[model samples]
Structures are given as C-alpha cells and as structure tokens.
Target: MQSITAGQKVISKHKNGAFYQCEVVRLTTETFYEVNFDDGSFSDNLYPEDIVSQDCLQFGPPAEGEVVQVRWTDGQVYGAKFVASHPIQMYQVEFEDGSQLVVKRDDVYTLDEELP
Candidate 1:
C-alpha cells in the first residue's frame, strides 16, 4: 500500500552496496534520480517493480574488473579492484596495495569521476 513519487526521499544504493540518500526523482516502475554523495551526484535509475519503496534502492554495477576508489576505512579513500557482489548488496574488493576488503557499493567510484 505504499508508493513513491518524484522528489521524495528514497534510500538508494549502488550495486556495490553503498547506501546513499536520494530524492525519488522519477515515478513509474523504474525510478530515476541523482545519486547524491555529499559533494556531488550521479544519474541512475532504480527499478522497484516487485518491491515497495522502503528499502530496495538499486543502481548499475561497476565496470568489469574496473579499478575503482573506495571512501571507507578511517575516512580513507583508496583505489581497489572490483571483485564481486552479494545477491542484494555488498561487494568484495582487493585494494591496490594487495589487500582485500569488503565495502559498500555506494562508497565506490570510478577514477574518472574523481576529476572534472
């Protein structure tokens, strides 16, 4: 019995498992919104067909074996190799320094996204 509309608040996330704060920017079976990460945003669509608008925020996954940056751990930002994902959320990654860690998908971004 619950639904969402444009400009409403939805806790959306990336396939990597980083839960982000987003405004339900679009309506319909698919949701379009600007993914917010404090200083900026990204365009995404979350399809909420079988689920309600309470906790099923989703977006595209990272590039295949792409080297992305993670903004986790002591507020530290480092580069990591994209590994795999869990069913609903969570991704395991190996850091550039030969270390492995599991991070939320939302805490990751492309290196190109770091610059203008």
Candidate 2:
C-alpha cells in the first residue's frame, strides 16, 4: 500500500480531466487524508487513489543541483535547477529567468521528457 503523511504535496485529477494541487493537512488513515487545496478549500477523506504523492507522480526523487523543468501553477514551463527538498517532497527550484520557487515534485521534471 502507498503511504502518505501530513504536509505532503500531492496532485489530484478532477472528473473533467483537469488537475489541481493540494497539501495534506491530516492523515486520517493510511489511505485517507484531510487536504487543504491551493484554492483554499478543505477536503476530508481524500483517498490515496484520488491523489498522488509528489515523488510517485514524478517517477522518482530529484537530486540537488539537477537540471529540471518546472511547470508553474499558471501553466507556464521554465528551465530550472533543483536546489533543495522541503517538507513533503516540495523542491526549491531556481528558474532560468532568475526566479525561485518552492514547488511540488509533480510540478518538476527532467528536461529530456516532453511536457504533457
């Protein structure tokens, strides 16, 4: 079984085929959690199948100083470097345009892969 914890960053897909990000606020069970979404709403009893952990969604963990591409919440993609790992798989990314942001692992990927 997949394990998730509080403070983890995760991605969830909607019925309309759109994706949104959320943060795990409370772990109700091994497979259920209370999530605080980016839009400021709260979701109780979010299931493991309903959301994916950043590390799992990214296919692996990102190493520090790795060159990566980040997809911003606004749907923009930019070249970036993996700087550090924050709580629950959030990474510190330094963008090519000189901007820095802490993003979920799902929001970052290797340059060799095409964006979906």
Candidate 3:
C-alpha cells in the first residue's frame, strides 16, 4: 500500500511498456487522483485503474545512438536519436513527418538492445 501526495512522486507505465513518472495534481480524492505527468505534458483524472497501480519497471537510459523509437501521446512509434544524456537527460526524435519529443529516460530504447 503506497501513498503519495501532490508533491510526492510516483511512477507508472504506458501501454507501450514505457515507464513514466508523475505527481499528484490534487491529493487522492476519495482515493482517486489527478495525474500531472512529467515534462509538463498533460494531466488526466486518475482512478484505481491507472497510476501507481502499475507494475512499473525501471530501465536504463538509452545510449546516444540507441534510440530506435519514441513516444507521442496520441500515436506514432517514431525513429529517434538519443541527443543528450550523460547520466544527464534529453530525448529528441522524429520520423519522416514526425515531431521532436522529450520522452522519459529508459522510456526510449535501442535497435541493438531489443535484439541482443
């Protein structure tokens, strides 16, 4: 049984199996919450079905050239490059007609790691 406040951070996963971090926008209201995700991305009404309710998994950040895909909230599994991160951060990606994104670390992966 884990508990978090609007200031307390917790993590969850996307349907793509990418782990994400978020803060409570408003404390658990009747045990439900508002999810204020990282990157100033977006917020949603959280319920028992989502959030820390996840079996979250932490993965290592991708190497500079390792990013093969990236996330866009709506759609698109984009081709990307690991532009920054030296125990630092940075995620920039785009496919033809794609957009640059700052997805979470370990949220992206490599063509090499997936196969080997």
Candidate 4:
C-alpha cells in the first residue's frame, strides 16, 4: 500500500479487475480514502490494489450500481439502493449512509452506470 493524495487516480486489486481507476476524492492517512468513479459512486477504505494510477482513465465502466440491472457476464439481474461492483473476490456495495460492504462479487449485478 502506498500513500496517495486526494484527486489522484488509483486501481483496486479486488474491484474493477485492476483495470478501473478511481479518483481519490478523500484521503485519511495511508490506510483510508474515498474514491470516486466516472459512473459516480465512490468507495472508502480502499486498498492500494483497488486502484491503478496509470492509464486508469481508460478502463470501462465498473459494475457499480449502474441504475440497477443484471450481469451480462451471467444472466441474473439484481440491484439495490447501494451501488455494486466486483474487483477480485469482493462484491463491493456503497450505501447512502456513506458506509460500504464487501461481499461476494457475484452476489449482485448492475446493468446501468451508477450516479454519485
């Protein structure tokens, strides 16, 4: 894990398949941060591997709660008020309360891009 600054782009090792780069909107020391994606939802307490600083902007839209839909990778469509995404083995969900949960990545599927 490396120290990062707010507004910097990072890649999560577990979410977005190491291809997605999230903007560092908020940072708390070297262990915690709030990452904002282009689709809108942001994640806190993100690990270093959860981001890739270089060429991060080229990644496709993450599975984050894209307006609530099904997974094209599979066939089941699911959604929640919280945004959803998959990076590595984690099924990350961000709720309105500014809290997030790391679950099984395949548990939920989103069809639309999430809005911040």
C-alpha local distance difference test of each model: 0.37, 0.42, 0.35, 0.36
lDDT for model 3 comes to: 0.35
Quick one: ranking by TM-score, best first? 2, 1, 3, 4
Candidate 2 clash figure, as a count = 0
Per residue, candidate 4 scores C-alpha lDDT tens digits across 2-108 of: 33444444433324432233443453323332345445545554443333332222553334333322222234333322243334433344433334344432333
The numbered model that scores best in TM-score is: 2
> Which candidate number maximizes lDDT?
2
> How many clashes (backbone N, Cα, C below 3 Å) per candidate?
4, 0, 0, 18
Per-model TM-score, in order, reads 0.26, 0.28, 0.24, 0.21
**Models, CA RMSD each:** 20.3, 19.6, 20.9, 18.4
Give, for candidate 4, the lowest lDDT window spanning 10 residues: 65-74
Worst lDDT run of 10 residues, candidate 2, spans: 47-56
| Model 4, runs deviating above 4 Å | 13-18, 29-116
lDDT of 2 by residue, 1-116 (tens): 24445555554332333444444444331323344444444444433233333342435434544544444445654454444432354444333233344444465444334457
Candidate with better TM-score, 1 vs 3: 1
Off by over 4 Å in 3: 1-57, 86-116
